[model samples]
Target: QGMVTIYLPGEQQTLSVGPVENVAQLVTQPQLRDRLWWPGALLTDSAAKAKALKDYQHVMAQLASWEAEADDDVAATIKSVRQQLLNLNITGRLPVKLDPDFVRVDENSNPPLVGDYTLYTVQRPVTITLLGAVSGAGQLPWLAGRSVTDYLQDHPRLAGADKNNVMVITPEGETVVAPVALWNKRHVEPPPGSQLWLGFSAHVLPEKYADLNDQIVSVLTQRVPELEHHHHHH
Candidate 1:
């Protein structure tokens, strides 16, 4: 039972709600709403955070090697993905994995594990980001409620992109793997602030780097958008 920073970005509120038992208890606070609540970005443990940083370094090194003998477009895509990783707050950040959206009807969904963490009211993100093996790294407008496959059409993928699988990382750290290939298609629409991480095909990379995309996705789940760190100086 220690301090919990309830960070509601759009609400512009950072309530220092201290000594809470679990997420169910934490929700008693007035500011956190059911409609737009996101998974918490926990900052209590050091081991997980350290490991996440190590994983980031490992992925970066692998990307550098992949670009060495790759074609110009492939090299460019790799470079763009590296920047995308950094910009997404995934390269160097702590690891946090928790789903705070349940437990009243389904109890113990977000048990109090971390002594120091931030409970967030999602900031109303306007773009669905495309990362990993995409044609380029960028975001698209989030107005049309487009299907995940539909979104992929807007951003061409790299030659190495795993057309068989795509990982959709929601703002709350949930990962949904959908197959958007010609042979198989799954209907999944990304929410705003969603990151469509196009994992490199496992066959292309050596065994060591095969897990790189999942590793990056792991960190993405753990990361807080840089904006969280900005308004948190208090």
Candidate 2:
């Protein structure tokens, strides 16, 4: 088990925890709900809250007025902003009001945070993702005592797979090299729930290059469908 630190924007005191834990345990802290901030503005402070509200309103209006036309400059601007929002959402940089309703209930008595937060856990992950030119372009359970070569061989490689260059993304967010079709190879075991991305051949471009791989990995690790749901929701 490892320690997880939570940083709240407006609050000076950071919440820290250790060992095996989940978002449920961290979010239930009363202080977290008490001092939420938005865009460097404290929601509890009236003047700051008003400024935040105005900014939000401006964004909403711009987003709402965007037309569906592909060639429209305003629509392009809106798309760019949408991507920014998506990135912020994925990175847990978007601040939200802590509402009891934001807490989602499952079949169990306790619930977890639905809005998401900047969470760091010492606990290793339990899944691994296979990305790029592969048939199993999704997450697979990280079996201990398995190497990168084992995973590549077990999973089917697509036609355009770049056999020589493979990228292994670790659970700690580090990128390392994994070689295929090379002599005197050294085997490396990817961390649990890490992403194994096979590079595509020069001739073919990977689909949804901007975010598909990372987004899929996030979905797999979180075991939460909200991101995918919201992604295709509109």
Candidate 3:
């Protein structure tokens, strides 16, 4: 039982996750939840949403360049606008939910633990998302002991799918690549609330976006309904 300091980006103060055994225990705290920010649900038109975020970032960059020379009023306004932009930026991308296991750290707290099995334990009835070149893109109830291969077998692959490249995106935005061809058998056990993307054919994708299958999964998976089970109990 010791105090754990959580550093808030750009904020001088830190919050404590004290007297905790496992990292999981602190994740449900309202204090932590209130501070955590991730991309909100973008129900439709992800390409548009992506452009919006890009534009917002560009504006923020432009604003920052003027901060030093601006007068008091303008500087204050710029600061406020920058803060607003940062807030939106935090909530403008993938990872609708923060992975609790990401909180665990070594003495220096440099790098967090990695991997589904190392970070995740059993949770009941979590939402698993399937998107990209799948026969049907939707959310499914996570089944215990199931793997990525099992889900694809049950749900037929769509015509656009690149069978050789499948991506498993965790809630924390970590990605694992898998192969789905009949002969290239591989098992990827994605954690609860993960997104499994079948990926579009490289030939169909533009050169820039061809390799970014994980980004597609990231944006689409945000459409999944938020899990209500995470609320703190009194």
Candidate 4:
């Protein structure tokens, strides 16, 4: 972070100051009592703090201008606004809920069900997601002791270059679930005990992979340490 100094046109001009620092400097506080100009405490209302935060963001943009172009007069006005509007001194990440639609199973079924489907099951210590890619989707036996290359061989679409873009994510963490071929592409060895996400796209190439990811995470969570099954929608 850099120090921003505002200068006024006159010798006795007023100045407003705010500390700047690296992202690591940001701190979280359960209560606003720790900070001096916390807007949340002064207003005693969330709406007020939200408005202040918006205005502060605007002034911050101006304050970020080059020193030669910065106007002390404007900075003074921003400083005053900060006292009333910048009180949103609260900061922390909000927890995310796994979406249900991502993994809920269908009520009705008929032979020859096709396109955009979710099939998953569990035994123990292993969770599998068979997301449809190319033409069909396939399921893997839980903890079946298969390598990335092995799974690709089982699923037609997952066999070649298609697996290159696949990624795996587990409660433990994310991995390249699909078989990777580096000679032609590269083979990626995921961490031991990593759950396979199989060949699905979300982070890259196919942007719509998020829909597939949503379903798998939901199912894995619900089936935690037990057998719970679900399906996904496109």
Which candidate's lDDT is highest? 1
Q: List model 2 lDDT by residue over 114-204, tens digit each.
A: 3323432222446776765566556687898888888877776655456676677654344677777668377888867566766444443
Span of ten consecutive residues with least summed lDDT in model 2: 37-46
Instruction: Candidate 1: list runs displaced more than 4 Å.
Output: 10-13, 33-36, 39-48, 69-73, 90-101, 104-108, 224-234
Candidate 2, TM-score vs. the true structure?
Answer: 0.42
Across residues 28-137, which tens digit of lDDT does each residue of candidate 4 receive? 21221233221111111233335445544543443233212425543333233223222223211111121212232343211121222111222223434444342233
C-alpha positional error of residue 54 in candidate 3 after TM-score superposition, expressed in Å: 2.3
Candidates sorted by TM-score, best first: 1, 3, 2, 4
Record all residue pairs in model 1 with backbone atoms less than 3 Å apart, i.e. clashing.
103-106
Q: Can you give the lDDT of residue 102 in candidate 2?
A: 53
Tell me the tens digit of each residue's lDDT in model 3 across 1-234.
Answer: 333454443334556655654334445567764445322211112443566466555545655665565565445544553453253321233232344444545553332312211112122226687765565456787888887887877777654457686787665555788777778878777777777767656654445444344444444343323332233531
TM value for model 4: 0.29
CA deviation > 4 Å runs, candidate 3: 1-52, 55-90, 93-125, 206-214, 217-234
Candidate 4 positional error at 144, Å: 6.1
lDDT of 3 at 149: 81
Candidate 1, poorest ten consecutive residues by summed lDDT: 90-99
Q: Which structure is stronger by TM-score: 2 or 4?
A: 2
lDDT of 3: 0.51
Q: Highest TM-score: which candidate?
A: 1
TM-score of each: 0.78, 0.42, 0.48, 0.29
